[PDB]
């Protein structure tokens, strides 16, 4: 596993010793090469994981997440260098250092064999994100958002630590292989109920679960473009990965304690999708669509079936790609008109036709058009939920109808109609922006031909 970790570490001295006008080129090239190397982890077994050493292991669930994490870094660098042009050299290097440290922490988090090491890295991911948001955000709300990001997470995850060191004192190990092989049932008691709550709420806050989602529309909106990309694409999936790992020791108690979270997710899906219909901020609309999408992942993890797990993995990867693309598409217009209001700049398809095509494709993937992997994950989750209870089809189906409603609405408001007269600074699209959209969308469509690579360990 060090053949990926060490080059990521070498990105730091390479960035700091680079020339004033070469940092972006070197960072992009070498992050792309690290993505190419990380592609080799997709060669997974059918029975057990890739146990590299006592510390790191790779699995059919974590390999696609690692590939997405390594692929996102060149895209963040490409999208960041435009709004950081007037910046001093040392602060550009510090920004790239934040991105590199975040990538290193995520790579180590997704492969750690031991739950306490996973916890330590999953918490270490907070510092670079907070620094990015509160230092390179644009508005005065970025401070408040940062606090909401910091304390929503910790308040959920501090009990988890207390639970983890508790478990190792009774079972003797926190190694995931030993944890899985030596599994024992969870008895029905108040102590076991609170141990279940301590092991779950930390990941539920990260999803985020409806009710504890208030930090997301602040953090994603107030963060710079790279911050929002990494927050939507990868940092949300940490909760899903942690829940899928830790639900092993929670059975059969999950059969009883999943009801409140299942109801919260199935109703907050409708709530967030309906909120998206009345949103004056385009970035806020995208952020709320993220919560609506992640509620389905929460449901799939809660019901604990192989089909639900496959759907959760596929939906997680597809959502990462789609939401990153949508954030970049919104930022392209933001750097033109310097406002996040959706109805300020209209009729942009007349003035920017190819970017309108990019908008259409991103909206199509957002509403889960077949045969996109978004649709694959959504349909697998819906089938598993239908097996869990037929009445679920009423809610899930409703969500679909709402999801197509606010997606195309978002497309119609910004692309169709007539252009606004006074806005006369809308320049033609750059090759950087077009290439960024293409590198977002091409892997998404390519994954249709080989979906088993994102269907997780239950395939």
């Amino acid at each position: 596993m060090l053949k990926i970790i060490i080059p990521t570490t070498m990105l730091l001295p390479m960035t700091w010793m680079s020339k004033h006008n070469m940092i972006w080129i070197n960072a992009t090239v070498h992050s792309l090469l690290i993505s190419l190397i990380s592609l080799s982890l997709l060669n997974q077994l059918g029975e057990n994981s890739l146990n590299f050493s006592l510390t790191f292991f790779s699995d059919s669930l974590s390999a696609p997440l690692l590939v997405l994490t390594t692929w996102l870094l060149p895209l963040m660098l490409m999208a960041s260098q435009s709004h950081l042009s007037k910046e001093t050299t040392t602060r550009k290097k510090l920004y790239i250092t934040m991105l590199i440290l975040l990538q290193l922490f995520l790579i180590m988090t997704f492969t750690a064999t031991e739950l306490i090491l996973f916890y330590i890295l999953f918490e270490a991911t907070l510092v670079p994100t907070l620094i990015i948001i509160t230092r390179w955000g644009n508005q005065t709300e970025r401070l408040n958002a940062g606090l909401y990001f910091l304390f929503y997470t910790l308040a959920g995850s501090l009990p988890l630590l207390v639970a983890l060191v508790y478990i190792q004192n009774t079972t003797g190990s926190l190694n995931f292989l030993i944890i899985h092989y030596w599994s024992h049932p969870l008895s029905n008691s108040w102590s076991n109920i609170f141990m279940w709550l301590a092991c779950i709420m930390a990941f539920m806050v990260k999803m985020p679960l409806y009710g504890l989602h208030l930090w997301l529309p602040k953090a994603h909106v107030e963060a710079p473009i790279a911050g929002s990309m990494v927050l939507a694409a990868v940092l949300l999936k940490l909760g899903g990965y942690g829940m899928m790992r830790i639900t092993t020791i929670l059975n059969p108690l999950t059969n009883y304690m999943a009801y409140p979270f299942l109801m919260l997710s199935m109703w907050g899906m409708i709530m967030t999708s309906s909120i998206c219909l009345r949103q004056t901020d385009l970035k806020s609309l995208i952020a709320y669509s993220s919560v609506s999408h992640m509620a389905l992942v929460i449901v799939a993890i809660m019901i604990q079936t192989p089909w639900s797990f496959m759907g959760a993995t596929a939906l997680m990867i597809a959502h990462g790609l789609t939401s990153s693309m949508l954030f970049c598409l919104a930022n392209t217009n933001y750097e033109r008109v310097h406002s996040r209001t959706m109805i300020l700049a209209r009729g942009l398809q007349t003035l920017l036709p190819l970017m309108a095509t990019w908008w259409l494709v991103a909206s199509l993937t957002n509403l889960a058009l077949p045969p996109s992997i978004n649709l694959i994950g959504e349909l697998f989750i819906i089938t598993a939920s239908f097996s869990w209870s037929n009445i679920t089809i009423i809610l899930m189906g409703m969500n679909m109808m709402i999801t197509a409603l606010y997606s195309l609405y978002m497309l119609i408001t910004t692309q169709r109609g007539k252009y606004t007269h006074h806005i006369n600074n809308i320049k033609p699209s750059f090759t950087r922006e077009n290439a960024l959209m293409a590198l977002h969308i091409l892997p998404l469509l390519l994954l249709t031909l080989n979906p088993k690579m994102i269907l997780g360990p239950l395939y």
Binding site: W136, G137, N138, Q139, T140, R142, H338
Partner: protein, 54 residues
């Protein structure tokens, strides 16, 4: 087209004696720039004595 940074109105919130001013606490004043208070010129009275005539 410019990132927001704190101004005087923002900075003045941290210039009081306490973070959250309270009706009673609003009368507290910040300490002097050096930790030196104005010298309390207390009038130390001299003893007045009659010497003589007896």
């Amino acid at each position: 087209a410019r990132q927001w940074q704190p101004d005087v109105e923002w900075a003045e919130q941290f210039g009081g004696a306490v973070m959250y001013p309270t009706k009673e606490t609003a009368h507290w004043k910040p300490p002097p720039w050096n930790d030196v208070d104005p010298p309390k010129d207390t009038l130390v009275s001299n003893l007045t004595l009659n010497f003589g005539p007896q």
